Amino acid sequence: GPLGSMSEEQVAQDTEEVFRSYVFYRHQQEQEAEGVAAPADPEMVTLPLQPSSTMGQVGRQLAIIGDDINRRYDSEFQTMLQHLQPTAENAYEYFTKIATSLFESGINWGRVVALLGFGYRLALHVYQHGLTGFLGQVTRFVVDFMLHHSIARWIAQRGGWVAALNLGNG
């Protein structure tokens, strides 16, 4: 059929749907193939777009083509991502550095697809290994609330947290 007559900006907007579809179908295939050996990631189990849409079908097609091939690289990317130690805090920097290096010598369709595959692996790795940082955020919520709503003051007046060692001791 006819190719679209596209602005740069429209392609960028469409990339959101292509990537979310890709991620959904790739994760689903991997769960089906590997069972309990596939890392859980509930961020990936919703498909927030029309599956029959053009971009839905593009993302699915890329996942289907990569199904068996991608699994051959699991071992080496597990090792490289473990060495990289990505976190929610530093993921934008590393993503940008890696993508820049990927395309430094030019663009072709395979490198575009590899960028989506790397996005998938990065999102999975950070979630799977508990590098999402959310517990750290909740910790900051607790501390900030206690400082500014006089809870820390109340505890200080009663001898500090050490006073809580008496709880559970008759």
Binding site: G110, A114, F118
Partner: peptide
Amino acid sequence: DMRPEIRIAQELRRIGDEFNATYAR
């Protein structure tokens, strides 16, 4: 250069070029 970000980028380039050779001609 053994920085993981560089090793990852180089492997993505290699894999992408292999994909390109197969499916885009």
